[PDB]
Amino acid sequence: NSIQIGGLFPRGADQEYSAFRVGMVQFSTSEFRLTPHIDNLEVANSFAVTNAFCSQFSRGVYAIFGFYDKKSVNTITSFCGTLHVSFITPSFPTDGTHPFVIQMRPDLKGALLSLIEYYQWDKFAYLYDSDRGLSTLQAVLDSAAEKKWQVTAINVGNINNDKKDETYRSLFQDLELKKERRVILDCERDKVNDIVDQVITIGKHVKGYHYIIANLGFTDGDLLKIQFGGAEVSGFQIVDYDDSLVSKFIERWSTLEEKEYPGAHTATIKYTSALTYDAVQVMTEAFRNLRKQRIEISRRGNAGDCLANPAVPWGQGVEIERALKQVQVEGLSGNIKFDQNGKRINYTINIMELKTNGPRKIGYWSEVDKMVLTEDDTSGLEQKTVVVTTILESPYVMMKKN
Amino acid sequence: NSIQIGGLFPRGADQEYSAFRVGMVQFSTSEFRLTPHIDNLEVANSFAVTNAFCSQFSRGVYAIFGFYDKKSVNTITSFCGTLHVSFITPSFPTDGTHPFVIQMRPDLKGALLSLIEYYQWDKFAYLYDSDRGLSTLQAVLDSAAEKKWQV
Numbered sequence: 317n318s319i320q321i322g323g324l325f326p327r328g329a330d331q332e333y334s335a336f337r338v339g340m341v342q343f344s345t346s347e348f349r350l351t352p353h354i355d356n357l358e359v360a361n362s363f364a365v366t367n368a369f370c371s372q373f374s375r376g377v378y379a380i381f382g383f384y385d386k387k388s389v390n391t392i393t394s395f396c397g398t399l400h401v402s403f404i405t406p407s408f409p410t411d412g413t414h415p416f417v418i419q420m421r422p423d424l425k426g427a428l429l430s431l432i433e434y435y436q437w438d439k440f441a442y443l444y445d446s447d448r449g450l451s452t453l454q455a456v457l458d459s460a461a462e463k464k465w466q467v468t469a470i471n472v473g474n475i476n477n478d479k480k481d482e483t484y485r486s487l488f489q490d491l492e493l494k495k496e497r498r499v500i501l502d503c504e505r506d507k508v509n510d511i512v513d514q515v516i517t518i519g520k521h522v523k524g525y526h527y528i529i530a531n532l533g534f535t536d537g538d539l540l541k542i543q544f545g546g547a548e549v550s551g552f553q554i555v556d557y558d559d560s561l562v563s564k565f566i567e568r569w570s571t572l573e574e575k576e577y578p579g580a581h582t583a584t585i586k587y588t589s590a591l592t593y594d595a596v597q598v599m600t601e602a603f604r605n606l607r608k609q610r611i612e613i614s615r616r617g618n619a620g621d622c623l624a625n626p627a628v629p630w631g632q633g634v635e636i637e638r639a640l641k642q643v644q645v646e647g648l649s650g651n652i653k654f655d656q657n658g659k660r661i662n663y664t665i666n667i668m669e670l671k672t673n674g675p676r677k678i679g680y681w682s683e684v685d686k687m688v689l690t691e692d693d694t695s696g697l698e699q700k701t702v703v704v705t706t707i708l709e710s711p712y713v714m715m716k717k718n
Numbered sequence: 719n720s721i722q723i724g725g726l727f728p729r730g731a732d733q734e735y736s737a738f739r740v741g742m743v744q745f746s747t748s749e750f751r752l753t754p755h756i757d758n759l760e761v762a763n764s765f766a767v768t769n770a771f772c773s774q775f776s777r778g779v780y781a782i783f784g785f786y787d788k789k790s791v792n793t794i795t796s797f798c799g800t801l802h803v804s805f806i807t808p809s810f811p812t813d814g815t816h817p818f819v820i821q822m823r824p825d826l827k828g829a830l831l832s833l834i835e836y837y838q839w840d841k842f843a844y845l846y847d848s849d850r851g852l853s854t855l856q857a858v859l860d861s862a863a864e865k866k867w868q869v
């Protein structure tokens with residue numbers, strides 16, 4: 317029953333962890349029940365990640381669930397490659413094929429490239445943050461030559477917070493040199509709200525400007541401050557609140573007490589936390605399929621010191637990989653299915669534009685069909701005031717007497 | 719007075735290791751010396767670098783000369799940054815202020831940003847590989863808007 321797993325959670329991720337415990341209750345059965353070992357660490361420091369991963373490998377876990385930053389992702393991936401320990405995470409996908417990793421986050425690259433091709437953009441800005449890797453940036457730069465775009469790529473990530481008001485105003489005066497009106501905010505939701513706060517201050521949110529929020533959590537941030545500005549805003553949504561399964565989860569989620577489960581009394585859930593809840597369901601059904609297939613997975617003895625030289629890989633970790641990558645269930649992220657590399661496949665991402673009446677589902681793409689949604693004939697406000705420009709020159713346009 | 723040192727060298731790098739051996743003989747003095755432990759490894763595997771760093775730390779070296787890739791660099795920086803071990807490298811610099819690291823290679827990007835200015839280039843082609851990295855590519859793109867370049 318007690319199947320041991322390793323848990324690595326950042327120190328600022330409250331809702332992301334509280335989503336893990338709710339998954340532990342919803343998916344626990346009488347056949348068996350997972351026994352997590354949790355340690356809160358600074359995810360950026362890779363030595364602590366190395367120390368914590370070895371702190372789990374010694375205790376004899378069968379799988380590990382955690383996170384990584386740009387600095388620490390290499391530590392996880394290579395340790396899990398030689399030790400055959402399976403790793404499930406909601407953090408960004410690796411920049412290539414890495415085994416013994418189960419990346420719950422879907423590949424956003426195919427969404428953004430297509431979304432730009434829908435709007436027929438041939439010149440746009442792209443403010444990226446290295447915190448989530450430059451895999452998305454390498455794609456737009458690669459596709460810049462095929463479709464003859466002219467990208468204005470600015471590493472907005474490396475900035476300090478005490479000179480933040482001076483440099484952000486200094487940034488848009490550089491974006492003003494080309495008269496740029498098409499920006500892509502490839503940042504995490506926190507930096508987005510920091511950018512959006514400065515966009516209103518200088519006043520670049522009026523009729524004409526068009527932004528893209530290039531992350532899976534469009535509705536997760538605060539969007540009411542540029543909703544009435546007039547500038548069109550796009551984004552991506554993976555946590556579909558239209559579906560019934562989520563509507564059931566939100567009912568139970570909306571009621572819970574916020575003292576025991578921090579960050580849970582709201583009506584929405586972050587795409588990080590939502591994937592955590594679904595990550596439990598993958599680890600559940602994986603060991604469940606290990607029972608039905610009659611496979612022995614318990615450790616023969618002590619795992620030992622992780623720095624084992626020569627390197628010792630336990631053979632029964634392979635079947636845990638093969639069982640994890642055969643899971644095909646339904647959750648908050650639509651269909652959840654994994655390829656031989658652990659990348660999400662068969663998935664569905666919604667495209668949301670911000671209008672006057674709040675968020676609105678307008679499009680969706682798939683790894684086999686792009687930009688399909690036809691059509692959003694329902695809803696619809698039917699309101700528009702066209703802007704006509706002219707010049708005061710007689711007799712075409714003259715001011716009246718009174 | 720035999721001082722012990724951690725030596726981290728990749729496999730395909732032979733002349734680099736040659737130069738290290740030459741430097742020791744040229745600078746070794748009569749009253750103290752450098753006693754290196756040389757772990758030849760593949761620099762890309764983060765576990766290997768971790769495994770090799772601890773083999774040097776347990777042997778009790780006083781400083782470590784080595785290299786790093788795009789992947790393994792963060793393994794070195796945090797490991798030395800917490801253990802206070804000194805690391806000396808000719809690999810490309812750290813994108814930031816990481817202590818206990820001695821970067822022998824100087825900052826090339828500032829020079830390239832200036833040379834492009836001298837030739838008065840306004841549109842050009844930039845070729846790069848993701849293996850070495852992209853910090854210079856981040857730099858040319860950082861000043862492509864500021865200086866009106868069509869990269």
Ligand SMILES: CC(=O)N[C@@H]1[C@@H](O)[C@H](O)[C@@H](CO)O[C@H]1O
Pocket residue numbers: 646650651662663664
């Ligand atoms: C070919 C295939 O497997 N299609 C499935 C579809 O049947 C299912 O309704 C949906 C759930 O979101 O996920 C898709 O991947």
